Coordinates of N, CA and C and ligand atoms in Angstrom, one line a residue:
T1 N 8.2 38.0 11.1 CA 8.4 36.6 10.8 C 8.5 36.4 9.3
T2 N 8.5 35.1 8.9 CA 8.5 34.8 7.5 C 7.2 34.2 6.9
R3 N 6.1 34.7 7.5 CA 4.8 34.3 7.1 C 4.1 35.5 6.4
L4 N 3.3 35.3 5.4 CA 2.6 36.3 4.7 C 1.5 36.9 5.7
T5 N 1.1 38.1 5.4 CA 0.1 38.8 6.2 C -1.3 38.1 6.1
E6 N -2.0 38.2 7.2 CA -3.3 37.5 7.3 C -4.3 37.8 6.2
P7 N -4.5 39.1 5.9 CA -5.4 39.4 4.7 C -4.8 38.8 3.4
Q8 N -3.5 38.9 3.2 CA -2.9 38.3 2.0 C -3.2 36.8 2.0
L9 N -3.0 36.2 3.1 CA -3.2 34.7 3.2 C -4.6 34.4 2.9
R10 N -5.6 35.1 3.4 CA -7.0 34.8 3.2 C -7.3 35.0 1.7
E11 N -6.8 36.1 1.1 CA -7.1 36.3 -0.3 C -6.5 35.3 -1.2
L12 N -5.3 34.8 -0.8 CA -4.6 33.7 -1.5 C -5.4 32.4 -1.4
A13 N -5.9 32.1 -0.2 CA -6.7 30.9 0.0 C -8.0 31.0 -0.7
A14 N -8.7 32.1 -0.8 CA -9.9 32.2 -1.6 C -9.6 32.1 -3.0
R15 N -8.6 32.7 -3.6 CA -8.2 32.6 -5.0 C -7.9 31.1 -5.3
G16 N -7.2 30.4 -4.4 CA -6.8 29.0 -4.7 C -8.1 28.1 -4.6
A17 N -9.0 28.4 -3.7 CA -10.2 27.6 -3.6 C -11.1 27.8 -4.9
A18 N -11.1 29.0 -5.3 CA -11.9 29.3 -6.5 C -11.3 28.8 -7.8
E19 N -10.0 28.8 -7.9 CA -9.2 28.4 -9.1 C -9.0 26.9 -9.2
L20 N -8.8 26.2 -8.1 CA -8.6 24.8 -8.1 C -9.8 24.0 -7.9
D21 N -10.9 24.4 -8.4 CA -12.2 23.7 -8.3 C -12.2 22.5 -9.2
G22 N -12.3 21.3 -8.6 CA -12.2 20.1 -9.4 C -10.9 19.7 -9.9
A23 N -9.8 20.0 -9.2 CA -8.4 19.7 -9.7 C -7.9 18.5 -9.0
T24 N -6.9 17.8 -9.7 CA -6.3 16.6 -9.1 C -5.4 17.0 -8.0
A25 N -5.0 16.0 -7.2 CA -4.0 16.3 -6.1 C -2.7 16.8 -6.6
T26 N -2.2 16.3 -7.7 CA -1.0 16.9 -8.3 C -1.1 18.3 -8.7
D27 N -2.3 18.7 -9.2 CA -2.5 20.1 -9.6 C -2.5 21.0 -8.4
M28 N -3.2 20.6 -7.3 CA -3.2 21.3 -6.1 C -1.8 21.5 -5.5
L29 N -1.0 20.4 -5.5 CA 0.3 20.5 -5.0 C 1.2 21.4 -5.8
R30 N 1.0 21.3 -7.2 CA 1.8 22.2 -8.0 C 1.4 23.6 -7.8
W31 N 0.1 23.9 -7.6 CA -0.2 25.3 -7.3 C 0.4 25.8 -6.0
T32 N 0.3 24.9 -4.9 CA 0.9 25.3 -3.7 C 2.4 25.5 -3.8
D33 N 3.1 24.7 -4.6 CA 4.5 24.9 -4.8 C 4.9 26.1 -5.6
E34 N 4.1 26.4 -6.6 CA 4.3 27.6 -7.4 C 4.0 28.9 -6.6
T35 N 3.1 28.8 -5.6 CA 2.7 30.0 -4.9 C 3.6 30.2 -3.7
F36 N 3.9 29.2 -2.9 CA 4.7 29.3 -1.7 C 6.0 28.6 -1.8
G37 N 6.7 28.7 -2.9 CA 7.9 27.9 -3.1 C 9.2 28.7 -2.8
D38 N 9.4 29.9 -3.3 CA 10.6 30.6 -3.2 C 10.4 31.8 -2.2
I39 N 11.5 32.4 -1.8 CA 11.4 33.6 -0.9 C 10.7 33.3 0.4
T40 N 15.1 23.3 3.3 CA 15.5 24.1 2.1 C 14.9 25.5 2.1
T41 N 14.7 26.1 1.0 CA 14.2 27.4 0.8 C 12.6 27.4 0.7
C42 N 12.0 26.3 1.1 CA 10.6 26.1 0.9 C 9.8 26.9 1.9
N43 N 8.6 27.4 1.5 CA 7.7 28.2 2.4 C 6.4 27.5 2.6
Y44 N 6.3 26.2 2.4 CA 5.2 25.4 2.7 C 5.6 24.0 3.2
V45 N 4.8 23.4 4.0 CA 5.1 22.1 4.7 C 4.0 21.1 4.5
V46 N 4.3 19.8 4.6 CA 3.4 18.7 4.5 C 3.3 18.0 5.8
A47 N 2.1 17.6 6.2 CA 1.9 16.9 7.5 C 1.4 15.5 7.2
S48 N 2.1 14.5 7.8 CA 1.8 13.1 7.6 C 1.8 12.4 8.9
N49 N 0.8 11.5 9.1 CA 0.7 10.7 10.3 C 1.4 9.4 10.2
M50 N 2.1 9.2 9.1 CA 2.9 8.0 8.9 C 2.1 6.7 8.9
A51 N 0.8 6.9 8.4 CA 0.0 5.7 8.1 C 0.3 5.1 6.7
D52 N 0.8 6.0 5.8 CA 1.2 5.6 4.4 C 2.0 6.8 3.8
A53 N 2.5 6.5 2.6 CA 3.4 7.5 2.0 C 2.7 8.1 0.7
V54 N 1.4 8.1 0.6 CA 0.7 8.6 -0.6 C 0.9 10.1 -0.7
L55 N 0.5 10.9 0.3 CA 0.7 12.3 0.2 C 2.2 12.6 0.2
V56 N 3.1 11.9 0.9 CA 4.5 12.1 0.8 C 5.1 11.8 -0.6
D57 N 4.6 10.7 -1.2 CA 5.0 10.5 -2.6 C 4.6 11.6 -3.5
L58 N 3.4 12.0 -3.4 CA 2.9 13.1 -4.3 C 3.7 14.4 -4.1
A59 N 3.9 14.7 -2.8 CA 4.7 16.0 -2.5 C 6.1 15.9 -3.0
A60 N 6.7 14.7 -2.9 CA 8.1 14.5 -3.4 C 8.1 14.5 -4.9
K61 N 7.1 14.1 -5.6 CA 7.0 14.1 -7.0 C 6.8 15.5 -7.5
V62 N 6.1 16.3 -6.8 CA 5.9 17.7 -7.2 C 7.0 18.6 -6.7
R63 N 7.7 18.3 -5.7 CA 8.8 19.1 -5.1 C 9.8 18.2 -4.3
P64 N 10.9 17.8 -5.0 CA 11.9 17.1 -4.3 C 12.5 17.8 -3.1
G65 N 12.7 17.1 -2.0 CA 13.2 17.8 -0.8 C 12.2 18.6 0.0
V66 N 10.9 18.3 -0.2 CA 9.8 19.1 0.5 C 9.9 18.7 1.9
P67 N 9.6 19.7 2.8 CA 9.6 19.3 4.3 C 8.3 18.7 4.7
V68 N 8.4 17.7 5.5 CA 7.3 16.9 6.0 C 7.4 16.8 7.6
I69 N 6.4 17.4 8.3 CA 6.4 17.4 9.7 C 5.7 16.1 10.2
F70 N 6.2 15.5 11.3 CA 5.6 14.4 12.0 C 5.5 14.7 13.5
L71 N 4.3 14.6 14.0 CA 4.1 15.0 15.4 C 4.4 13.7 16.3
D72 N 5.6 13.7 16.8 CA 6.0 12.6 17.7 C 5.6 13.0 19.1
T73 N 4.4 12.5 19.5 CA 3.9 12.8 20.9 C 4.5 12.0 21.9
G74 N 5.3 10.9 21.6 CA 5.9 10.0 22.5 C 5.0 8.8 22.8
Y75 N 3.7 8.8 22.4 CA 2.9 7.7 22.6 C 2.7 6.9 21.3
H76 N 3.6 7.1 20.3 CA 3.5 6.4 19.0 C 3.8 4.9 19.1
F77 N 3.3 4.2 18.1 CA 3.7 2.8 17.9 C 5.1 2.7 17.4
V78 N 5.8 1.6 17.7 CA 7.1 1.3 17.1 C 7.0 1.2 15.6
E79 N 5.9 0.6 15.1 CA 5.6 0.5 13.7 C 5.5 1.9 13.0
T80 N 4.9 2.9 13.8 CA 4.7 4.2 13.2 C 6.1 4.9 13.1
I81 N 7.0 4.7 14.1 CA 8.3 5.3 14.0 C 9.1 4.6 12.9
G82 N 8.9 3.3 12.7 CA 9.6 2.6 11.7 C 9.1 3.0 10.3
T83 N 7.8 3.3 10.1 CA 7.3 3.8 8.9 C 7.8 5.2 8.6
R84 N 8.0 6.0 9.7 CA 8.6 7.4 9.5 C 10.0 7.2 9.0
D85 N 10.8 6.4 9.6 CA 12.2 6.2 9.2 C 12.3 5.7 7.8
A86 N 11.4 4.7 7.4 CA 11.4 4.2 6.1 C 11.0 5.2 5.0
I87 N 10.0 6.1 5.3 CA 9.7 7.2 4.4 C 10.8 8.2 4.3
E88 N 11.5 8.4 5.4 CA 12.6 9.4 5.3 C 13.8 8.8 4.5
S89 N 14.1 7.5 4.6 CA 15.2 6.9 3.9 C 14.9 6.7 2.4
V90 N 13.6 6.4 2.1 CA 13.2 6.0 0.8 C 13.0 7.2 -0.1
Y91 N 12.2 8.2 0.4 CA 11.7 9.3 -0.4 C 12.6 10.5 -0.3
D92 N 12.6 11.3 -1.3 CA 13.4 12.6 -1.3 C 12.6 13.6 -0.6
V93 N 12.6 13.5 0.7 CA 11.8 14.3 1.6 C 12.6 14.7 2.9
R94 N 12.6 15.9 3.3 CA 13.2 16.4 4.5 C 12.2 16.3 5.6
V95 N 12.3 15.3 6.5 CA 11.4 15.1 7.6 C 11.7 15.9 8.8
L96 N 10.7 16.2 9.6 CA 10.9 17.0 10.8 C 10.1 16.3 11.9
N97 N 10.9 15.9 12.9 CA 10.3 15.2 14.1 C 9.9 16.2 15.1
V98 N 8.7 16.7 15.0 CA 8.2 17.8 15.9 C 7.8 17.1 17.2
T99 N 8.5 17.5 18.3 CA 8.2 16.9 19.6 C 7.8 18.0 20.6
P100 N 6.9 17.6 21.5 CA 6.5 18.6 22.6 C 7.6 19.0 23.5
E101 N 7.5 20.1 24.2 CA 8.5 20.5 25.1 C 8.7 19.6 26.3
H102 N 7.7 18.9 26.6 CA 7.7 18.0 27.8 C 7.6 16.5 27.2
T103 N 8.4 15.6 27.9 CA 8.4 14.2 27.5 C 7.2 13.5 28.1
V104 N 7.1 12.2 27.9 CA 6.0 11.5 28.5 C 6.1 11.3 30.0
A105 N 7.3 11.0 30.4 CA 7.6 10.9 31.9 C 7.4 12.3 32.6
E106 N 7.9 13.3 31.9 CA 7.8 14.7 32.5 C 6.4 15.1 32.6
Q107 N 5.5 14.9 31.6 CA 4.1 15.2 31.7 C 3.4 14.3 32.7
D108 N 3.8 13.0 32.8 CA 3.2 12.1 33.8 C 3.5 12.5 35.2
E109 N 4.7 13.1 35.4 CA 5.1 13.6 36.7 C 4.5 14.9 37.1
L110 N 4.3 15.8 36.1 CA 3.8 17.1 36.3 C 2.3 17.2 36.5
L111 N 1.6 16.6 35.6 CA 0.1 16.7 35.6 C -0.6 15.3 35.8
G112 N 0.2 14.3 36.3 CA -0.4 13.0 36.5 C -0.2 12.0 35.4
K113 N -0.1 10.8 35.7 CA 0.1 9.7 34.7 C -1.1 9.5 33.9
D114 N -0.9 9.1 32.7 CA -2.0 8.8 31.8 C -3.0 9.9 31.6
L115 N -2.5 11.1 31.1 CA -3.3 12.2 30.9 C -4.4 12.0 29.8
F116 N -4.1 11.0 28.9 CA -5.1 10.7 27.9 C -6.4 10.1 28.5
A117 N -6.3 9.4 29.6 CA -7.4 8.8 30.2 C -8.2 9.7 31.1
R118 N -7.5 10.7 31.7 CA -8.2 11.6 32.6 C -8.7 12.9 31.9
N119 N -7.9 13.4 31.0 CA -8.3 14.6 30.2 C -7.7 14.5 28.8
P120 N -8.3 13.9 27.9 CA -7.7 13.7 26.5 C -7.6 15.0 25.8
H121 N -8.5 15.9 26.0 CA -8.4 17.2 25.2 C -7.1 17.9 25.6
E122 N -6.8 18.0 26.8 CA -5.5 18.7 27.2 C -4.3 18.0 26.7
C123 N -4.3 16.6 26.7 CA -3.2 15.9 26.2 C -3.0 16.2 24.7
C124 N -4.1 16.1 23.9 CA -4.0 16.4 22.5 C -3.6 17.9 22.3
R125 N -4.0 18.8 23.1 CA -3.6 20.2 22.9 C -2.1 20.4 23.2
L126 N -1.6 19.8 24.3 CA -0.2 20.0 24.7 C 0.7 19.3 23.8
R127 N 0.4 18.1 23.4 CA 1.3 17.2 22.7 C 1.1 17.2 21.1
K128 N 0.0 17.7 20.7 CA -0.3 17.7 19.2 C -0.5 19.1 18.7
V129 N -1.4 19.9 19.3 CA -1.9 21.1 18.7 C -0.8 22.2 19.0
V130 N -0.3 22.3 20.2 CA 0.6 23.4 20.5 C 2.0 23.2 19.8
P131 N 2.5 22.0 19.8 CA 3.8 21.8 19.0 C 3.5 22.1 17.5
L132 N 2.4 21.6 16.9 CA 2.1 21.9 15.5 C 2.0 23.4 15.3
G133 N 1.4 24.2 16.2 CA 1.3 25.6 16.0 C 2.7 26.3 16.1
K134 N 3.5 25.8 17.1 CA 4.8 26.4 17.2 C 5.7 26.1 16.0
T135 N 5.4 25.0 15.3 CA 6.2 24.6 14.1 C 5.7 25.4 12.9
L136 N 4.4 25.5 12.8 CA 3.8 26.2 11.6 C 4.1 27.7 11.6
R137 N 4.5 28.3 12.7 CA 4.9 29.7 12.7 C 6.1 29.9 11.8
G138 N 5.8 30.5 10.6 CA 6.9 30.7 9.6 C 6.5 30.2 8.3
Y139 N 5.7 29.1 8.2 CA 5.2 28.6 6.9 C 3.9 29.3 6.6
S140 N 3.8 29.7 5.3 CA 2.6 30.4 4.8 C 1.4 29.5 4.5
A141 N 1.7 28.2 4.3 CA 0.7 27.2 3.9 C 1.2 25.8 4.4
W142 N 0.3 24.9 4.7 CA 0.6 23.6 5.0 C -0.4 22.6 4.4
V143 N 0.1 21.5 4.0 CA -0.6 20.5 3.2 C -0.9 19.3 4.1
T144 N -2.2 18.8 4.1 CA -2.6 17.7 4.9 C -3.2 16.6 4.0
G145 N -3.3 15.4 4.5 CA -3.8 14.3 3.8 C -5.3 14.0 4.2
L146 N -6.0 15.0 4.6 CA -7.4 14.8 5.1 C -8.3 14.4 3.9
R147 N -9.1 13.4 4.1 CA -10.1 13.0 3.0 C -11.5 13.2 3.6
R148 N -12.4 13.6 2.7 CA -13.8 13.9 3.1 C -14.5 12.6 3.5
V149 N -14.0 11.4 3.2 CA -14.7 10.2 3.7 C -14.2 9.8 5.0
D150 N -13.3 10.5 5.7 CA -12.8 10.1 7.0 C -13.9 10.1 8.0
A151 N -14.8 11.1 8.0 CA -15.9 11.2 9.0 C -17.0 11.9 8.3
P152 N -18.3 11.6 8.8 CA -19.4 12.4 8.2 C -19.3 13.9 8.5
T153 N -18.6 14.3 9.5 CA -18.4 15.7 9.7 C -17.4 16.4 8.8
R154 N -16.6 15.6 8.1 CA -15.6 16.1 7.2 C -16.1 16.0 5.7
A155 N -17.4 15.9 5.5 CA -18.0 15.7 4.2 C -17.7 17.0 3.3
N156 N -17.8 18.2 3.9 CA -17.6 19.4 3.2 C -16.2 20.0 3.4
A157 N -15.2 19.1 3.6 CA -13.9 19.5 3.7 C -13.4 20.2 2.4
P158 N -13.0 21.5 2.5 CA -12.7 22.2 1.2 C -11.3 21.8 0.7
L159 N -11.1 22.1 -0.6 CA -9.8 21.9 -1.2 C -8.7 22.8 -0.7
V160 N -9.0 24.1 -0.8 CA -8.1 25.1 -0.2 C -8.9 26.0 0.7
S161 N -8.4 26.4 1.8 CA -9.1 27.3 2.7 C -8.1 28.0 3.6
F162 N -8.6 28.8 4.6 CA -7.8 29.5 5.5 C -8.0 28.9 6.9
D163 N -7.1 28.1 7.4 CA -7.1 27.5 8.7 C -7.1 28.7 9.7
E164 N -8.1 28.8 10.5 CA -8.2 29.8 11.6 C -7.6 29.4 12.9
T165 N -7.2 28.1 13.0 CA -6.6 27.7 14.3 C -5.1 28.1 14.3
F166 N -4.4 27.9 13.2 CA -3.1 28.4 13.0 C -2.9 29.6 12.1
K167 N -4.0 30.1 11.5 CA -4.1 31.3 10.7 C -3.1 31.2 9.5
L168 N -3.4 30.2 8.6 CA -2.6 30.1 7.4 C -3.4 29.2 6.4
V169 N -2.8 29.2 5.2 CA -3.5 28.5 4.1 C -3.4 27.0 4.4
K170 N -4.6 26.3 4.3 CA -4.6 24.8 4.4 C -5.2 24.2 3.2
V171 N -4.4 23.2 2.6 CA -4.8 22.6 1.3 C -4.8 21.1 1.6
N172 N -5.9 20.5 1.1 CA -6.1 19.0 1.2 C -6.2 18.4 -0.1
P173 N -5.1 17.9 -0.7 CA -5.2 17.3 -2.1 C -6.0 16.0 -2.1
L174 N -6.0 15.2 -1.0 CA -6.6 13.9 -1.0 C -8.1 14.0 -0.5
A175 N -8.7 15.2 -0.6 CA -10.1 15.4 -0.1 C -11.0 14.6 -0.9
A176 N -11.1 14.7 -2.2 CA -12.0 14.0 -3.1 C -11.7 12.6 -3.2
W177 N -10.5 12.1 -2.7 CA -10.1 10.7 -2.9 C -11.0 9.8 -2.0
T178 N -11.3 8.6 -2.4 CA -12.0 7.6 -1.7 C -11.1 6.5 -1.3
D179 N -11.6 5.4 -0.7 CA -10.8 4.3 -0.3 C -10.3 3.6 -1.6
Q180 N -11.1 3.5 -2.6 CA -10.7 2.8 -3.9 C -9.6 3.7 -4.5
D181 N -9.7 5.0 -4.4 CA -8.6 5.9 -5.0 C -7.3 5.6 -4.3
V182 N -7.2 5.6 -3.0 CA -6.0 5.4 -2.3 C -5.5 4.0 -2.5
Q183 N -6.4 3.0 -2.6 CA -5.9 1.7 -2.8 C -5.3 1.6 -4.2
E184 N -5.9 2.1 -5.2 CA -5.4 2.1 -6.6 C -4.0 2.8 -6.6
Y185 N -3.9 3.9 -5.9 CA -2.7 4.7 -5.9 C -1.5 3.9 -5.3
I186 N -1.8 3.3 -4.1 CA -0.8 2.5 -3.4 C -0.4 1.3 -4.3
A187 N -1.4 0.7 -5.0 CA -1.0 -0.4 -5.9 C -0.2 0.0 -7.1
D188 N -0.5 1.1 -7.7 CA 0.2 1.5 -8.9 C 1.5 2.2 -8.7
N189 N 1.7 2.7 -7.5 CA 3.0 3.4 -7.2 C 3.9 2.7 -6.2
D190 N 3.4 1.7 -5.5 CA 4.2 0.9 -4.6 C 4.8 1.8 -3.5
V191 N 3.9 2.4 -2.8 CA 4.2 3.4 -1.7 C 4.3 2.6 -0.4
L192 N 5.1 3.1 0.5 CA 5.3 2.4 1.8 C 4.0 2.6 2.6
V193 N 3.7 1.6 3.5 CA 2.5 1.6 4.3 C 2.8 1.1 5.7
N194 N 2.3 1.7 6.7 CA 2.5 1.3 8.0 C 2.1 -0.2 8.2
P195 N 2.9 -1.0 8.9 CA 2.5 -2.4 9.0 C 1.3 -2.6 9.8
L196 N 0.9 -1.7 10.7 CA -0.3 -1.9 11.5 C -1.6 -1.6 10.6
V197 N -1.4 -0.8 9.6 CA -2.5 -0.6 8.6 C -2.8 -1.9 7.9
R198 N -1.7 -2.7 7.6 CA -1.9 -4.0 6.9 C -2.6 -5.0 7.9
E199 N -2.4 -4.8 9.2 CA -3.0 -5.8 10.2 C -4.4 -5.4 10.6
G200 N -5.1 -4.6 9.8 CA -6.5 -4.3 10.1 C -6.7 -3.2 11.0
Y201 N -5.9 -2.2 11.1 CA -6.0 -1.0 12.0 C -6.8 0.1 11.3
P202 N -8.0 0.5 11.8 CA -8.7 1.6 11.1 C -7.9 2.9 11.0
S203 N -7.4 3.4 12.0 CA -6.6 4.6 12.0 C -5.3 4.3 12.7
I204 N -4.3 5.3 12.6 CA -3.0 5.1 13.2 C -2.7 6.5 13.9
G205 N -2.5 6.4 15.2 CA -2.1 7.6 16.0 C -1.4 7.2 17.2
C206 N -1.6 7.8 18.3 CA -1.0 7.4 19.6 C -1.6 6.1 20.0
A207 N -0.7 5.3 20.6 CA -1.1 3.9 21.0 C -2.3 3.9 22.0
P208 N -2.4 4.7 23.1 CA -3.5 4.6 24.0 C -4.8 5.1 23.4
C209 N -4.8 5.9 22.3 CA -5.9 6.5 21.7 C -6.2 6.0 20.3
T210 N -5.9 4.7 20.0 CA -6.1 4.1 18.7 C -7.0 2.9 18.9
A211 N -8.1 2.9 18.1 CA -9.0 1.8 18.1 C -8.4 0.5 17.7
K212 N -8.2 -0.5 18.6 CA -7.6 -1.8 18.2 C -8.6 -2.6 17.4
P213 N -8.1 -3.5 16.5 CA -9.0 -4.3 15.7 C -9.8 -5.2 16.5
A214 N -9.3 -6.0 17.5 CA -10.0 -6.9 18.3 C -11.1 -6.2 19.1
Ligands
ADX1 N1 0.8 12.9 14.1 C1 0.5 13.6 12.9 N2 1.6 14.1 12.5 C2 1.6 14.9 11.3 N3 0.5 15.1 10.7 C3 -0.7 14.6 11.1 C4 -0.7 13.9 12.3 N4 -1.9 13.5 12.5 C5 -2.7 14.0 11.6 N5 -2.0 14.6 10.7 C6 -2.4 15.3 9.5 O1 -4.0 15.2 9.4 C7 -4.3 14.3 8.6 C8 -5.2 13.2 9.4 O2 -6.4 13.6 9.8 P1 -7.4 12.6 10.6 O3 -8.4 12.0 9.6 O4 -8.1 13.3 11.7 O5 -6.4 11.3 11.2 S1 -5.6 11.6 12.6 O6 -4.4 10.7 12.7 O7 -5.3 13.0 12.8 O8 -6.6 11.4 13.8 C9 -3.0 13.7 8.1 O9 -3.1 13.5 6.7 C10 -1.9 14.7 8.5 O10 -1.8 15.7 7.3
SF4_2 S1 -4.1 10.9 20.9 FE1 -4.2 10.5 23.2 S2 -2.0 10.2 23.8 FE2 -2.0 11.2 21.8 S3 -1.8 13.4 22.2 FE3 -4.1 12.9 22.0 S4 -4.8 12.5 24.1 FE4 -2.5 12.4 24.2

C-alpha cells in the first residue's frame, strides 16, 4: 500500500510527540505537512464532524487543497450537510464524503430498523468506525479536532501519538484549546459554524444520537 511501515510510524509519532511539546496548532499542522506531504499528492488527511470550520481553516491555511474526510452515516442533520457543503464551497479544501457500504434503509432491512436504539455499538462500528478505517488505509497520518476539555476521560489526550485502532499517526492540534480559545478563533477568523451549534446544541453528530437542548 501507500502507508509507512508500522515501526516507522511509531518512531515518527514518538519523535513528533517529543518534538512538538507545547506547540501551537499551526506548528503541529506544519510539522504534519512537512512530514507526510509529498510522495492531490497529500499523504495525510483531516477529519471534521462539520460542527465548525476551525480545524478546516487551519489545515487550509497550512496546506491549500488538503483532504478532509466527513463520515456521512446517513443519520446526519440537514444543517450538518449544509455546513459540509458550505465548508467545501468556501474553503480551499478537497472534501471526501465517506459513506458506509450499506444505506440506512438497507441496514434497517438487514439487521432491523433503528439499530442505534437496539445496539448502538454495532451501528457506530458499521457506519463510523469501519468506513473510517477503510478510508484511512493509505494515509500515514490523520488530523482530528479532539480537545482535552471534551470529556474528563480525554484530559490526557496527547498532541501526537500512534492510533492503535487504525495503526497510524494521530495528531490533535486543538487538544490544548479551551472553549475561550475556539470562541476567540471563530470571532477573529470568521469561520463557518453549524447552525445547530448556534441554537444551543452541545455536540453535533447523528440525529438519533445527539443530545437535544430541550
Ligand atoms: N462524522 C465525523 N466525520 C469526520 N470526523 C469526525 C466525525 N466525528 C468525529 N470526528 C473527528 O473526531 C473529532 C470529534 O471527537 P468527539 O469529541 O468525540 O465528537 S464526536 O462528534 O465524534 O462524538 C472531530 O474533530 C473529528 O476529527
Ligand atoms: S451515532 Fe447513533 S446513528 Fe450514528 S452511527 Fe453511531 S449508533 Fe448509528
